[PDB]
Amino acid sequence: QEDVLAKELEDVNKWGLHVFRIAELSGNRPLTVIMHTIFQERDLLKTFKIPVDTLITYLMTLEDHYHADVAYHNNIHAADVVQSTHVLLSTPALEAVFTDLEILAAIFASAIHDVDHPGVSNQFLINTNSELALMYNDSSVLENHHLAVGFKLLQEENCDIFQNLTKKQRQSLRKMVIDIVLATDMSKHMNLLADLKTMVETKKVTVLLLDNYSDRIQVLQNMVHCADLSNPTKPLQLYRQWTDRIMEEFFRQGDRERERGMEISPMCDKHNASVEKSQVGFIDYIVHPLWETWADLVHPDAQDILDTLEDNREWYQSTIP
């Protein structure tokens, strides 16, 4: 079983990694093994003097805080976003662009980006006067929570993976991670995309030229947001599994709403839903506009990813008539 897991992990640098198989082969530890593999591949343990035992202790602890009974926003999704970010970071157009600390920040942010997710949306938490919404004043409720949990867990016994970073490095990484995870709030999508389009239009090359730090964090924010919204760009057998999972989570939220006498949110009514039309709409209005813009920034590095997205859109559309 360990040999079979080792075989699947050879594809860690490839779009379309069999992440569900890795989750099963690792004994429900996809986040831990994928993060460990990526840290080794990028030589991050040596660069930041991270003890291996500390890294594993932190990762297992973090993974434990993803909920086992939430269909989509679980440790498998975290592992997938981590691995997807890892691939985007290695795009030829961005070679030598980011510092080792910026790379560490992006991968760490991806790992913690949805930790302790309850399987319901920010709007649901707000509308139900939840403890989380009261704590966070209705603003990036989940995302603020994911960050607080991810950082707080570093303080557990033998969990501080940043113990050998300088004070300056820890301060910088903390700010970058906060800026990145907050950008995963799906209410910020339109502003994030508008800013990304402006960067494409004012692009300078010779490899992308991002001498300014404010431009670099903006690229990392969009990168992680792309990874978060990468399901429809993956091979169809993976994409369909992600669709099944998000719909299960949405339908469960709708059951909670219906039990409370609340109006059922869009796409959350199992008795009145069109999964296929909803995926086509999701791609057309959100995912394709985002990915076409990313592809333009790194042209032509992401062409195969965009082609797959387009093929998947056509497939889902073809099932409707």
Ligand SMILES: COc1ccc([C@H]2CNC(=O)C2)cc1OC1CCCC1
């Ligand atoms: C695989 O699909 C999806 C994958 C990811 C998301 C993110 C944005 N909202 C979330 O809760 C997470 C939505 C999806 O589809 C939604 C729109 C159509 C139905 C669900």
Ligand SMILES: [Mg+2]
């Ligand atoms: Mg999220």
Ligand SMILES: [Zn+2]
């Ligand atoms: Zn996510």
